[PDB]
Each structure stands twice: as C-alpha cells, then as structure tokens.
C-alpha cells in the first residue's frame with residue numbers, strides 16, 4: 001500500500017553528471033520490496049556504448065541517464081541529456097508496468113532532461 005519513492009543518491013548522481021559532467025551515464029533500478037528507485041551503476045566521464053549497453057540487463061527493465069555528447073565540425077563538444085526507459089521484451093509484464101507507471105514520477109526528480117527514449121532489444 002506504499003508508493004514509489006526515490007533514493008536521494010539518484011538526484012545527487014544526476015546532479016554531478018549535469019553540473020560537472022563526471023559521469024557518462026547512470027543506471028537506475030526499482031527495488032519493489034523497498035519501493036524505491038536506487039542507483040545501480042554510475043559510469044566514468046567517458047564510457048563506450050558497449051560498456052553502457054552491458055549495464056542494461058537483457059531480462060530486466062531499468063531507467064538510465066546518458067550524457068550524449070558529440071563534436072561539431074568546428075571541433076566543438078556539445079551534449080544532450082538522454083533519459084532512457086529500458087524495457088527488454090522478456091522482462092515480466094508486471095515489472096514493465098511498474099517501470100512505466102513510475103517513469104514520470106521519477107523523471108520529475110531529474111530536471112534537465114533534453115531527450116526521452118524508450119528502448120528495447122529486438123534480438124531477444
């Protein structure tokens with residue numbers, strides 16, 4: 001009969017990424033038993049796509065923030081903060097609903113998101 005809370009460390013890790021750009025990405029997980037979103041993994045300032053992808057379980061949903069930077073032709077570095085709702089096909093329908101129904105509430109704690117994505121792997 002309890003709602004979905006968000007552990008303080010979630011915003012703190014996000015704040016470091018947004019303010020200091022010290023983390024390439026952050027992977028969040030919902031602990032249903034404790035009914036709270038927690039930090040599962042925090043990446044170094046520079047991480048490959050493979051290292052990030054490795055952090056998204058093929059059998060479970062997650063939320064993630066990815067600081068997607070790119071270099072312009074003028075050799076200028078820019079970045080967009082991506083919010084990602086990872087929803088693999090084999091995850092339990094129940095878990096998918098839990099992540100989906102708590103998505104907006106969690107996002108609300110992460111001011112500064114510029115692009116929102118929902119991702120799945122069709123190579124299940």
Ligand SMILES: CCCCCCCCCCCC[N+](C)(C)[O-]
Nearest residue numbers: 053056057058066068082119121
């Ligand atoms: C910043 C780029 C946004 C792309 C996010 C897409 C992440 C997909 C990761 C697939 C995970 C692969 N898997 C299931 C084997 O773990």
